[PDB]
Design an enzyme around this catalytic site. Sequence first.
Site, PDB file in Angstrom:
ATOM      1  CG  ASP E   7      36.408   1.807 -36.458  1.00 36.46           C
ATOM      2  OD1 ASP E   7      36.337   1.967 -37.613  1.00 36.46           O
ATOM      3  OD2 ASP E   7      37.497   0.747 -36.311  1.00 36.46           O
ATOM      4  CG  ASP E   9      34.561  -2.837 -30.792  1.00 37.23           C
ATOM      5  OD1 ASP E   9      34.318  -3.372 -31.886  1.00 37.23           O
ATOM      6  OD2 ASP E   9      34.111  -3.401 -29.828  1.00 37.23           O
ATOM      7  CB  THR E  43      30.464  -4.138 -35.644  1.00 36.91           C
ATOM      8  OG1 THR E  43      29.448  -3.216 -35.375  1.00 36.91           O
ATOM      9  CG2 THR E  43      30.764  -5.022 -34.536  1.00 36.91           C
ATOM     10  CG  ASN E  44      37.448  -6.099 -36.784  1.00 34.54           C
ATOM     11  OD1 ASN E  44      37.165  -6.669 -37.659  1.00 34.54           O
ATOM     12  ND2 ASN E  44      38.358  -6.245 -35.976  1.00 34.54           N
ATOM     13  NE  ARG E  50      40.614 -14.191 -28.177  1.00 35.69           N
ATOM     14  CZ  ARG E  50      41.648 -14.779 -27.535  1.00 35.69           C
ATOM     15  NH1 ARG E  50      42.051 -14.146 -26.522  1.00 35.69           N
ATOM     16  NH2 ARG E  50      42.400 -15.628 -28.179  1.00 35.69           N
ATOM     17  CG  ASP E 103      39.238   2.926 -29.854  1.00 39.18           C
ATOM     18  OD1 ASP E 103      38.907   2.523 -30.884  1.00 39.18           O
ATOM     19  OD2 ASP E 103      39.283   2.528 -28.537  1.00 39.18           O
TER      20      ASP E 103
END
Lengths: 155, 155, 155, 155, 155, 155
Positions: E7, E9, E43-44, E50, E103
């Site tokens: 992930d 972030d 990457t979400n 946002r 995380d």
Amino acid sequence: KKLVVLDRDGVINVSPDEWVALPGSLEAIARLNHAGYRVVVATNQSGIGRGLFDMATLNAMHLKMHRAAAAVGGRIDAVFFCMMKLIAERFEIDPADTPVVGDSLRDLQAGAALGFRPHLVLTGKGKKTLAAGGLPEGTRVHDDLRAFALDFLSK
Amino acid sequence: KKLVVLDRDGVINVSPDEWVALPGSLEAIARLNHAGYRVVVATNQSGIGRGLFDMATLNAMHLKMHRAAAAVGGRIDAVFFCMMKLIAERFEIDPADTPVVGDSLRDLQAGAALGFRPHLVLTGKGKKTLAAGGLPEGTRVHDDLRAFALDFLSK
Amino acid sequence: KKLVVLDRDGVINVSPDEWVALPGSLEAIARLNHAGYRVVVATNQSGIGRGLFDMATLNAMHLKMHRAAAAVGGRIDAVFFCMMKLIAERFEIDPADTPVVGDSLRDLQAGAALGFRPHLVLTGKGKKTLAAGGLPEGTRVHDDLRAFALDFLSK
Amino acid sequence: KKLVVLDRDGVINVSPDEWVALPGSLEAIARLNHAGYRVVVATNQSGIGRGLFDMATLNAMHLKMHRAAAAVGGRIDAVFFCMMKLIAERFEIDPADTPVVGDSLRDLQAGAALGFRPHLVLTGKGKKTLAAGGLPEGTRVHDDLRAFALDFLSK
Amino acid sequence: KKLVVLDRDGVINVSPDEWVALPGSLEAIARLNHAGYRVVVATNQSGIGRGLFDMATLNAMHLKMHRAAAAVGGRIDAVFFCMMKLIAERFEIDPADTPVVGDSLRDLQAGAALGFRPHLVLTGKGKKTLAAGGLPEGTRVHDDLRAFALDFLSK
Amino acid sequence: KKLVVLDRDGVINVSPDEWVALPGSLEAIARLNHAGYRVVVATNQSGIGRGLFDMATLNAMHLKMHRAAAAVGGRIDAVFFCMMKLIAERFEIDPADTPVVGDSLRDLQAGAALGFRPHLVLTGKGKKTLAAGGLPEGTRVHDDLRAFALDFLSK
């Protein structure tokens, strides 16, 4: 079971314990009653003195509100919000078959997005709202709740 | 009049009818009462199932809470918010002589800036808040409200 | 279904309707419940203001008792006597697998004679009973019900 | 400088790179351009083959998009979302003066919540959306994007 | 070819304008690469301020990222989501042989539900996530990615 | 005026384009920056294949350095020499208050002659230099640049 959504401030009424209704508004609710509508009165809690209250203040207000309607033989369903997203859900209604009545842009604009039929009353913030514009395409505008009830009661 | 401000969620307790208090928290309040403190319970209305409630739902919760305090002979002063600037104002107390107890960051930093002495409980959000940090300089940390009450009642 | 027999007076609580429990006993009851014990609260009827009562007083006391239990998510089975000789049979238990908890010689000695595992709590008459001596050979002694519950939940 | 917000999927076009526009939709964009409108094409990124993509697939897709418009002399501003609430910020426009065009409830209801003038096109989900109902009060309906532009360039 | 699903972030980096990696995370990627692992960085996209971005912005972030790994001689496979259900599918790997590292709770439970071996880094949301609990049975915890790589590279 | 002079070769990094930095060296510089130091990276141009370069390669060479630093949020002042005698000139610094860091005798000996504080890192030629001896009286020795920054950050 048909429904009508009303704002409290500037729609039914003008110290939180000195609560006083517009005389045309009680007529509106009762006349709505005989025509068979369940009247939900939505009280926006952001306007409760910035959130400082015990249970005593809340009960006195609903009782004042409850007895005001009863004084002329009317019935309301009192809800408190801290909205339209839930009102169509908490109650048994198709939003497309339901009027929302208010004096502010925030509420009417919120309601219309879900299919609610928005009505604007020119009492209180109503006259300010109309002139400012930015209202939903099919909004009908009324002098007061008495007028809404009278008009909304023909066809 | 000495005072103690408590957050409700994750501090005292875990239509919402399945309401249940922590046993250590009831003891906590009772010990606080006998020591002469007014115990104010601050409930963020932002936690009432997102604003879906009639007066009935509201009454049930205050009664559930009240009977819990009464169950061990304790008394709370119930306030509902939709904060601290006003709690310090509705009550006639010196903030420098007043603890605020919670499990979340938002409230404790708000209270301490006005002089409140911030206490954190590790119940609910408590363990999470501690690790995230960013807490006021003089914040004391407790296992629970029972621990706060025991620790706090020293002077 | 495991069991624990508790006296009402001086074990759980300190006018029959102005009834108030020690919070640690509520914790104990909740702690025992979560551990899977059916908790029987045995009330000696000669201690309802020394045998003077109507039904209203009885109902209020029973609801006071349950609401106390409910406040922390607890469950009790409150039975009323005019004891141990019948309780193990009214409920389905081998007396040898059940603790009896009390503040008096009479019942603990009665239960132990039946095989019950006797526990004394030093709250209320507890300090008096201990000093008077004459307790059954294998009697275990605890500061309170909170202490009993902690110790008991080990095996 | 005036603006028009378009959803991409089911509005402009029929593997994410195997992207093909409706010929009438290209005409629409050019006609909107020539009349001085900036055309923003909003791509819901959870609709890039249901949210699975690297940069290569993303780049070609934007290029396929860019190349489709250029073929007929059009200009678009392609933005990608993972909505209406932010579009009004990247661009400086009054929602009350801006149409949002889509074939789905999600977007138009979202747009209408901001004051956007909701338009539905019957391409893709459009007929499905139309029949499903629950659309905002002032929702306008067009056979396709070619038709929207014609109707829109009337006022 | 063995793989590691990462992930981005709170794991690898601290507006995409100022996008900056932890120096230890760069070492980790290079050390992992050299051991014959392909490093996939997920990457979400809900977290690009946002979801507000053009193509330049997406490319810039991908370039900042691509340049970082190479700067210390590392190689990554950057994927973008708008998950685990597809990654083990877009790539040809048995989930039972692949660590997923994040995380956050959101990430690890999805991977673990598919057979992925969940790893938590205490960077970013990590320490708060650990405290929040509710994480999968076999979750291993590392201070950071640099630490993960050391632990992971043992057998 | 605070400042730190670093050699490039064997201090920061391991074809002029196949340039790769130590992750600890990237970290060190940022730590030095955030602590408020301007970092000069000295590239002795006589050690990059005898001057066989035009402008394209040199900028590329400089850009690689810029991007490595930026990857971790760092700032360097890259200088190229064809030294310390001049370094003290482009910048406004007292040599006695400025450390020089390299992996070789030649540069450290040059700096110390000017009042510079010589530091040896054992990366690259560092191990060669230490064993060879002949270093200035007060020369400090560190495992790497990552190590240098920590000791230096003491006063």
